[PDB]
């Protein structure tokens, strides 16, 4: 090819290519190392990635996201039935299969989850192609360890539809381990804990690695815990602030709320490297601008319970793996949310001071490992 490694994420996707013994995590047209798993449909065009998420606040009904939550599932699926209630876009039943229904060029159209994901994969593929200046055909696509055969088949199908020859579908936690070279043979088995706190889901896997063979010792997590929940706590905090200073409640203005949410998500990232972040939105509500700031401490306070709750699934996993804290030789951070200093502290404290593998951007670790494995399979 070369073959590329693609992390098709719930909220953000990432692509990397292994060349000259090094992995290149490829930046998109906007210079972003990860790309939103969004697709939007309008009267005139279909948008994918950044372009799609950038207009989600004004086109909520025809901007699709969270396709990964539907992929490979039946319409009757209790989780599908639950999730549907929270999405602004429509999900219909087509012969027992869920399809998202949107308006595109004035006409009603429905897409299978793999079709939406194929669009996201197409974007990732083109991102790699612009960098490589060559056609990308072969790829390794990652999936959560919990995915069943249907979910995996559907993920592979999305790749096929995107024009990719999926060399192999591998687990995200295994990919993260590969990224750190933990798959290299050393004879004696090693116990690795993958702590993945992403944009929408939280997952922990305990793997036992002996001579490159990955033995999943245990798994645990929360399919509904991620960075978006942290943005939320900030949103409500600022809705209260605006209401105090301006005696106006923006809660019912869908667009104002989405704009504030974006501002919060951004401030949140800055808070991972700075102890303070500024928020300056123009024409937030009724021509009123919202210029404010938030401290790391405040952000931590607003999310204290959520942050700490991540430890329960960790204890659970260890217990199920019939392993003690001390038996974990490596702790790998995955997911953009593990970049939050407070999260790292909680996890380290829990592991009594143990160092965390975090040199590779957590939100890129999956793609990184996938890129390495793709090279190996090529
Ligand atoms: N520097 C950072 N600090 C805190 N949160 C971050 C940072 N960078 C990204 N995030 C958050 O990480 C989440 C996305 O994680 P990512 O691993 O890229 O996606 P996914 O979970 O879909 O695989 C989002 O909630 C995003 O806001
Ligand atoms: Cl792009
Ligand atoms: Cl390393
Ligand atoms: Mg992820
Ligand atoms: Na991702």
Residue 10's CATH number: 3.30.420.40
For residue 111, the domain's CATH number is 3.30.30.30
Residues 167 and 213 in one domain: no
Taking each helix axis from N to C end, the angle separating 172-179 and 365-377, rounded to the nearest 10 degrees, works out to 80
Q: What are phi and psi of 358, to 5 degrees?
A: -140, 20
Angle formed by the axes of helices 311-320 and 341-350, to 10°?
Answer: 40
**76: which 2 tokens?**
């009757």
Q: Is residue 40 domain-shared with residue 126, that is, in the same domain?
A: yes
What is the Cα–Cα distance from 68 to 158, expressed in whole angstroms?
11
Q: 247 and 280: one domain?
A: yes
Query: CA dihedral defined by 72, 76, 78, 79, rounded to 10 degrees?
Result: 30
Cis peptide before 2 (omega within 30 of 0): yes
136-172 residues labelled b (16+ CB within 10 A) or e (exposed): bebbbbbbbbebeeebbebbbbbbebbebebbbbbbb
150 among the known binding-site residues? no
Q: Note down the domain range covering 258.
A: 226-309
Answer yes or no: do 139 and 177 share one domain. yes
Kindly state if the Cβ of 114 falls inside 6 Å of ligand 1: no
Same domain, 256 and 109: no
User: Which ligand 1 atom sits nearest the alpha carbon of residue 268?
Assistant: 4
Using DSSP bridges, classify how beta strands 276-285 and 213-222 pair: parallel, antiparallel or unpaired.
Answer: unpaired
Long-range CB pairs of 247-250, under 8 A, 24+ apart, other chains included: 248/285, 248/286, 248/288, 250/284, 250/285
Catalytic residues: 7, 68, 172, 196
**Solving technique:** X-ray
Tokens of 8: 């098709």
Distance CA 308, CA 166 (A): 38
What's the first-to-final CA gap in the chain, in angstroms? 8
* 232 and 363 belong to one structural domain: no
Regarding whether 319 and 230 lie in a shared domain, the answer is no
Shared domain for 281 and 244, answered yes or no, is yes
Instruction: Report yes or no: 197 and 343 within 8 Å, Cβ to Cβ.
Output: yes
Burial degree of 355 (CB within 10 A; 0-12, 13-18, 19+): exposed
Residues 90 and 50 in one domain: no
Contact 132, 2 (CB under 8 A): yes
Alpha helices in 172-310 (DSSP H): 172-179, 227-246, 254-270, 296-308
Domain final residue, candidates 248, 281, 309: 309
Atom of ligand 1 nearest to the CA of 273: 1
CB atoms within 10 A of CB 131: 16
* Backbone φ and ψ of 304, nearest 5°: -40, -55
Tell me: do 339 and 267 sit in the same domain: no
Give how many domains the chain has, as a whole number: 4
d(CA 328, CA 331): 7
Q: Do 9 and 143 have their domain in common?
A: yes
CATH number of the domain to which 292 belongs: 3.90.640.10
Radius of gyration of the chain (CA): 21
> Quick check: CB of 336 below 6 Å from ligand 1?
yes
Structure tokens at 374: 């793709």
CB proximity list for 275: less than 8 A, separation 6 or greater = 295, 296, 297
Q: CA-CA distance, 369 to 176, in Å (whole number)?
A: 5
Strand partners, 209: 190, 214
Residues 58 and 135 reside in one and the same domain: yes
Distance CA 197, CA 218 (A): 17
* Overall resolution, Å: 1.9
What separation in Å is there between the alpha carbon of 108 and the centre of ligand 4?
Answer: 31
Q: Residue 273's CB: how many other CB atoms inside 10 A?
A: 10
Residue 295 counted as an annotated binding residue: no
């Amino acid at each position: 090819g070369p073959a590329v490694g693609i992390d098709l994420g719930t909220t953000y996707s990432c692509v990397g290519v292994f060349q000259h013994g090094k992995v290149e995590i490829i930046a998109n047209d906007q210079g972003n190392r990860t790309t939103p798993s969004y697709v939007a449909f309008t009267d005139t065009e279909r948008l994918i990635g950044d372009a799609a998420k950038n207009q989600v606040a004004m086109n909520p009904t025809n901007t699709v996201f969270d396709a990964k939550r539907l992929i490979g599932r039946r319409f009757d699926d209790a989780v599908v039935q639950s999730d549907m209630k929270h999405w602004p876009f429509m999900v219909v039943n087509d012969a027992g299969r869920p399809k998202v229904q949107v308006e595109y060029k004035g006409e009603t159209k429905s897409f299978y989850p793999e079709e939406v994901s194929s669009m996201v994969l197409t974007k990732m593929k083109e991102i790699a192609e612009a960098y490589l200046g060559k056609t990308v055909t072969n790829a390794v696509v990652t999936v959560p360890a919990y995915f069943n055969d249907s979910q995996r088949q559907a993920t592979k199908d999305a790749g096929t539809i995107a024009g990719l020859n999926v060399l192999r579908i591998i687990n995200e936690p295994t990919a993260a381990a590969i990224a750190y070279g933990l798959d290299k043979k050393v004879g004696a088995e090693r116990n690795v804990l993958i702590f993945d706190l992403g944009g929408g889901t939280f997952k922990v896997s305990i793997l036992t690695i002996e001579d490159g063979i990955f033995e999943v010792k245990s798994t645990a997590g929360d399919t509904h815990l991620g960075g978006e929940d942290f943005d939320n706590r900030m949103v409500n905090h600022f809705i209260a602030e605006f209401k105090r200073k301006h005696k106006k409640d923006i809660s019912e203005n869908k667009r104002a709320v989405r704009r504030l949410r974006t501002a919060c998500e951004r401030a949140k990232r800055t808070l991972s490297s700075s102890t303070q972040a500024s928020i300056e939105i123009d024409s937030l509500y009724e021509g009123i601008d919202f210029y404010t700031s938030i401290t790391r401490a405040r952000f931590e306070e607003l999310n204290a319970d959520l942050f700490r709750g991540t430890l329960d699934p960790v204890e659970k996993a260890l217990r199920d793996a019939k392993l003690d804290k001390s038996q974990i030789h490596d702790i790998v951070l995955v997911g953009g949310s593990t970049r939050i200093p407070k999260i790292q502290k909680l996890l380290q404290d829990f592991f009594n001071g143990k160092e965390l593998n975090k040199s590779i951007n957590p939100d890129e670790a999956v793609a990184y490992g996938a890129a390495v494995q793709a090279a190996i399979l090529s």
